[PDB]
RNA sequence: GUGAAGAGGGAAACAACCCAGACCGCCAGCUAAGGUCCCAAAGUCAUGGUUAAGUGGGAAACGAUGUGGGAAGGCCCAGACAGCCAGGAUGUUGGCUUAGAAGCAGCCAUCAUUUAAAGAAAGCGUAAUAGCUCACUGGUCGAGUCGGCCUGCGCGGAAGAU
RNA sequence: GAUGUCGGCUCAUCACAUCCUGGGGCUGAAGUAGGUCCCAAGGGUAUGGCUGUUCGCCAUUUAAAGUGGUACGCGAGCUGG
């Protein structure tokens, strides 16, 4: 998973929102993967996604992420009742909301950094594109 | 594909140009006969010391005859003897076994200038230089 | 062949070409890593 | 298409003639001999054919290139032919002539009649190795092409008739 | 004109430093063999001769936006070309070091100062005095096609005796 | 140092500013300076693949609107919700 | 909202969908959603764009030299890019290891050199020493080609009880 | 207002993602034998035991010992342990 060192949340809702997260630019670097629709993302695949672009680039600048998980979501067991209650904590989710950016870069050479993201992509369950800043 | 190239290297001892062994498969599949390249060999001044690899290149054309130019000595003999070693460092930049002076590479270099190429003096010096550093020879006067 | 899709370039004469609607790798000295589909 | 836009490579002594997207290739030597291109743009030039773009079962230059090729190949055709000299590797599995008939195996004692269409023939130097004549660049491996149909090479040590691209291209086992 | 390095920086580069050289040499190229050139710019730069490997494409247009040697029968096809700005005998000497390992009768035809020298002619050079009397032997229109022309055919004996 | 056009365009509604996101075109603005926020629209392709250069940005910009150049530099964007096209434009004159 | 407490029209249909709110009668007409080759009322629609796959008209990730359009861009007749042919070089059959181990058996030097030319080598290879393609150069070569990006379409992913 | 169950038998049948031969690609396949592997529903596709048992354990057949479904197929079929 991606987690945090403290917390001040436990047993959030399923977190339903009703349009956007206004983050749709390129403000971290020059260049970015974009989202362009909405989902979840476990915590583990934001991990995999930088661990990825790391393995491909071996660091020639700084990476910029712009995901972070924030409500912890339950399951009840596969066998019994659900809908009655509310079972154990079983993961936490990063909402990626939609044309919001996922992961920038500027200090790595940019048709390298496009590669290593072509590449975390495939770790993602939804499509996405390349987006070039083009402005201030 | 074309089986058979041009202007073909060899670097073999007096003593080893017509004993097999020394010489692995290559002139074989070039088309030419060993006792054949012992008699081409044999022919220049400086090709008759046994145990000192001479190099000599030949070219063959398209019916396997071949023609050939005979050459001065190379530097990787001349640097293992002014270096005063008989043996190289193993991996050289780690491990070394002597330094050559710099006026020895020119004078070297100009019983090389029928193998070599380079434009000034100092080019040949240069090409040379690191010959040299693989036997773990450190280049400075 | 293997029976994967995504087609992979692995040598100089990769020329990947569409044989009755599946992609091949092509191979003439090294068909160690010849695909079917893609 | 690059190759759509050639000088054709066809001489003036051999008077090539537009038929719709029908061409029949005429003049000196040889025999007549045709090709088939369909979706394309043509004009007639004289003998030396223009081709251009066409969206019907082409995709916009798809067979422009193509007919350019073709045209030039039954013109080869007529003046000489292409190549003819036809190999097999190993033992048992014939190659060898016997008048209008070739005779290959599978491996075994008895042939399995390939034949020769007209204007077409072949003949033999020794029982592997197939010496073909005629006056097209198509009907000559044509006839080669049905011909490795029977037996085929086999990858790591050819087993059958090899010609043009076959399927003996070797492989390694050990490095590291 | 100019976008490279090694292609377009050779077109405004060819037929001008050889407009510039006292002798050249106009050789079919892929049939003097490209090796051959490379194991004789060993002997090549002990004598100050040039040697630039060029196809037709450079050559097809060092006639137009550039001046030429007025020369075009060895501009057409493959060409090798050498030259030389010091000792005009040796790049033709230097032509002749090439039958020991494929042939030295690859000349098609030769240029001298801008003036077009046929390939049976040229060869007086690549016997190689002394610079002075190479010069001697041959120029461009200066002297050649003034007084020259007469020596041509009353020595028509031997190439080395022909002079300008 | 990067060269575009541009076409004189007033809107408050939702109507008339959907009406440019339907048919490709989008809105900027060019304010402060020796004038009034002055309201443009922009096409979407013109920043996109007819442009991708750093230098839309980083050095002065040509922008003709009435056969009127000022100079302008950039300032902040906001980026399509479902595309990688631009929504909006912000401009400071230069 | 609709059904519940509504007919008809269209949808392979139903008790809820999309259109609308059945007074009835009228061999009248229009418009809606929906349709317009035949089933079936009206477009095998005119003009431009693209796919050769029954995709269309079942759906994702995704990948690649599958393919086109488009503006901006490297190369751009002064001659391309890939490829096929040819050279594939000089010190270098360097040092160690070894029959040879010579970019390519292993490991270190992974460079230099004449340069209009060749990476102490991208890929292969009789299983390894050999041999080979390969840019760049020079043949073929005289017009498009490929990387980015926006964008139409293709591909395999997309196999089940009558 | 429920179609009547398990295990075994009767009786089958349909989906092919084929157990197998058949045509064909690859192999880190030398040849051979295998692994890998697409195409393809036509046909053939076994039997006793102990236990009310599936599975179990054991012996065997054939070149071979399949995949998946059927109101947990079929009680207006059989037994009724």
Redesign the interface.
Known sequence: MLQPKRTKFRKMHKGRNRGLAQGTDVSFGSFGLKAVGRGRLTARQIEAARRAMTRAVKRQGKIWIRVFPDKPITEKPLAVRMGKGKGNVEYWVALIQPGKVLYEMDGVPEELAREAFKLAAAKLPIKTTFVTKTVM | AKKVQ??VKLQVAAGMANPSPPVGPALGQQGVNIMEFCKAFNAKTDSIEKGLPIPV?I?VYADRSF?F?TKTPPAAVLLKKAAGIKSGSGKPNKDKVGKISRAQLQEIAQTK???????DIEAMTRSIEGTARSMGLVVED | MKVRASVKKLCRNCKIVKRDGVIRVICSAEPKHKQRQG | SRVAKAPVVVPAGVDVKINGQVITIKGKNGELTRTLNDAVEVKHADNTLTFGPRDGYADGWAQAGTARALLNSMVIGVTEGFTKKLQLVGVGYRAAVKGNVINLSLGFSHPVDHQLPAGITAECPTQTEIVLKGADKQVIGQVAADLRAYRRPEPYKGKGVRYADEVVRTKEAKKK | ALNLQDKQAIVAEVSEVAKGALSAVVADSRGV?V??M??L??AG??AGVYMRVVRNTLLRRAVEGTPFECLKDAFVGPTLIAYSMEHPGAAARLFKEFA???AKFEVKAAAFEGELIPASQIDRLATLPTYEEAIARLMATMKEASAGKLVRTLAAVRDAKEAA | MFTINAEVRKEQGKGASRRLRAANKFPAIIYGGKEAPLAIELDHDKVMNMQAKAEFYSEVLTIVVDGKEIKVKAQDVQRHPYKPKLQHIDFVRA
Do not use: L
């Not at chain 2, 200038?113 to 434009?119: C, F, I, K, R």
């Open positions: 041009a202007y290149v070219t023609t130019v200038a029928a193998d070599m190429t380079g434009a | 063999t090796d051959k490379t194991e710019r060993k730069r002990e020991k390992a494929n």
